[PDB]
Amino acid sequence: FDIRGVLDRGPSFKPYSGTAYNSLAPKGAPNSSQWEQKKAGNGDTMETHTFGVAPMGGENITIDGLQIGTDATADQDKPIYADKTFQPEPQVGEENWQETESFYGGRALKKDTSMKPCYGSYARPTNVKGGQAKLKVGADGVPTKEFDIDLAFFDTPGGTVNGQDEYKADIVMYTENTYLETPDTHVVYKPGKDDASSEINLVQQSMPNRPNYIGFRDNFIGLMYYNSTGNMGVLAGQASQLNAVVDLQDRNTELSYQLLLDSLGDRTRYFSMWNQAVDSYDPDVRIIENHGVEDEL
Amino acid sequence: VVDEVNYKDYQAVTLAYQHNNSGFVGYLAPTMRQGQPYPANYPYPLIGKSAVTSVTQKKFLCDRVMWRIPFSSNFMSMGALTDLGQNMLYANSAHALDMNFEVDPMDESTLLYVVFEVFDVVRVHQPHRGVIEAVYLRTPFSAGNATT
Amino acid sequence: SAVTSVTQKKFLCDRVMWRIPFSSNFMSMGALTDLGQNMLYANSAHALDMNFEVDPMDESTLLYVVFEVFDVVRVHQPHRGVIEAVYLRTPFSAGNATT
Amino acid sequence: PYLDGTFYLNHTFKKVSITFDSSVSWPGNDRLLTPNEFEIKRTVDGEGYNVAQCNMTKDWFLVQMLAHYNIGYQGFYVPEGYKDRMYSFFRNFQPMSRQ
């Protein structure tokens, strides 16, 4: 019987053991993100803190953000600004081995995007250039093609060293809303009970979800009724209609079928037409055989 | 694979603008780490909540084996000398044969290797000391050579 | 400074059903049991309780006792579009009550 | 486990008695080392009726090498490769011990 149809597994399904997003990250790592805080907030000032990193250099920071290039001379010179929609790419850094003191631009999340650890973090691209900021909504996001990215500048915390005296800013972070999803890691420690961005939600950790493989049974067990009442099969004449199938409740013709394939060939070779592939566990998982670890070096 | 027309938040993001393992791997090279930790964006979830619409791709591989079509009425072989080879041995007739193959496109120049299975038999007789003789029969693709 | 220690032993078996043959001469040759020639039906009581002591732990279990028999069938077609079958099982029969 | 070959609780049996009557029992014309019960396993053993390095009774091991293979009366040997299958007793039996 050649059955066709559409199978659907729930969200329970997950046919791998790791995570598919930010696997090399520390599980404690938090993303570059922001949170509003009310400690010295309140009124027309609200402390919006930032935890993050700005990884790639520029040559200046103006109010157009990082200037990541310069236009070659043609009787003119103008600094090329980095696009807010996808530049500063978070995969681009430096190839020294880490530097400090120059101009640097990075990215961050808003406090309207709830924190989740950087270990399962995913947000779908909303642009073809790898941008992933949400579109602005005035009442509809469909015709609005302005993306939500707001610059935030920073500078060394001296008052006689830069800023107030000796004007300039040293870092810029392209802060955006994004569709932050962890679709394969579950939070396993958190210290608060808030899901909203906070200072203490940088400390959340997440381990991956359980591997859960779902497939059809071994020889398509239970995909046909055997040994049944009212669901029993018919093979009979077309005139006489004398059924030559008598099914008994106290008979098992699916177990019987399994045992027959160990009367016939090897059962350790898989077949795909009839979907054969015997259930077998790893025997070193079944019986744990410790032997320590060879580790004298 | 992700639907490119039935998933409505599909975006074609090329290799350059993909990121996943941001800040923990180099930029498009086996060089040192570059970037900052950030949410990935490369594969779309096909599992769990917010799984994207998808379609199946199906193929097989098959290496180290040539395809073969027996030349008999039933494709099973009941002997070395087939039952349709003996049509032309109990009443010989010459026929033309055209085989039309359809194959996948491939960028590189390719060859088709067709094996036409025959009987290739040598019958070696040595009748006298220091003498060896042989006769080579080859059936529906007889030897046109007989070179030195 | 190794501590005093007892031993503990067990085995595992997975995918095996515990088989006990029946009749005479424990070597398994043939399949037929000649108790049809001992009496045709003359039974009374003489017990037949299988009692399995089992290990308990917590939530419910089921026991499966397979009673091994013949499930022979002859399938005969005497004419076009006619098929019949006769079924026999002898130690545990499937017919004779409404038959 | 019912509809597939999978099983995994065969080690949780202690004894089966196939009673016929309460002055004798099925094979019990003196045959086994405990003629009134098949002990699958022993918890404590004064007599030494375990078989090496697990709990299994010598009687039970004899019965399950003559049920699956026919060896016991010519002394135990490792079954052949075609006599020993994935559901056959021998390759699923796993003794173990620890302190």
Partner: peptide, 26 residues
């Protein structure tokens, strides 16, 4: 053990220069 036993106990005769005999005779 678990029972199977069926027809064709030995080689099916066919004079091995060929792969046949007959359907019987009538």
């Amino acid at each position: 053990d678990i029972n199977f036993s069926s027809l064709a106990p030995r080689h099916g005769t066919r004079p091995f220069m060929g792969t046949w005999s007959d359907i019987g005779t009538s």
